[PDB]
């Protein structure tokens, strides 16, 4: 039997103003969302595992980084009691900058990273340079992959090029999913409310095959920017 993750940590880590049409595209343009940026942190057998590691230190007190010295990733990591060189894996959702911005302070960790996403991001406007320092230790995947036991990623491509979401067995929890923006609301992923996003269609089989997983697995789910859940979640110190 595979070990399950010992914690599953939901970390705060600042937040992002966007017009509230990035949640569902029907919605007329003119109404700012404040929505949370998330990263996670996993304990395992082998060790931890850190998925996403927030904004830029360049969005610190300056699309609306709503960003403190507080979110910066390495005072989360301060503060989760961890040195990037503790952690065993990180694990990039897709690099858009309120995901992968904290990526340069982890220089010897294997970056798990979709393929698709990668040379997205060598290439394509949206990315920023944070996002993509060229001489870390990237571990580039294709598509589904367990990285350790307990933890699976699930290639969910749509929102960005090679956006991955995660499918986590926890000790204290069971069966957990983490669309991160695969899905920004509960309703984009449920009633399929149309949201921002590299290719929609793709976004959308994307959703469809989560839900194929969910008829399996029947586990809880977090979305990826969704303010309604927000506050009724476990969050740091506390673990799921
Ligand atoms: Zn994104
Ligand atoms: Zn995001």
Redesign the pocket.
């Known amino acids: 039997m595979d070990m399950t993750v010992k914690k599953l940590y939901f970390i705060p880590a600042g937040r992002?103003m966007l017009d509230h049409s990035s949640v569902n595209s029907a919605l007329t343009p003119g109404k700012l969302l404040n929505?949370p940026?998330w990263c996670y942190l996993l304990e395992t057998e082998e060790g931890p595992i850190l998925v996403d590691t927030g904004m830029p230190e360049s969005a610190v007190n300056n699309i609306l980084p709503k960003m403190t010295e507080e979110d910066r990733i390495v005072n989360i990591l301060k503060r989760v009691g961890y040195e990037p060189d503790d952690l065993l894996y990180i694990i990039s959702?897709?690099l858009?900058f309120?995901?992968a911005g904290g990526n340069g302070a982890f220089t010897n960790t294997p970056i798990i990273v979709q393929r698709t996403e990668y040379e997205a991001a060598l290439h394509r406007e949206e990315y920023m340079k944070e996002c993509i320092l060229p001489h870390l230790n990237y571990k580039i995947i294709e598509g589904d992959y367990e990285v350790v036991p307990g933890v699976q990623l699930l290639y969910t491509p749509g929102?960005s090029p090679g956006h991955q979401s995660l499918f986590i067995k926890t000790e204290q929890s069971g069966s957990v999913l983490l669309t991160?923006?695969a899905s920004?609301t509960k309703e984009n992923f449920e009633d399929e409310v149309p949201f921002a996003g590299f290719d929609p269609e793709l976004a959308l089989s994307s959703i469809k095959r989560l839900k194929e997983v969910v008829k399996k697995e029947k586990p809880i789910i977090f979305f990826?920017?969704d303010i309604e859940q927000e506050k009724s979640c476990r969050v740091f110190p506390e673990y799921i």
Do not use: P, T, W
Request: overall charge negative; proline content about 0%; charged content about 15%.
């Open positions: 992002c929505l940026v959702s897709h858009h309120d995901h929102h991160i923006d920004y990826g920017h």
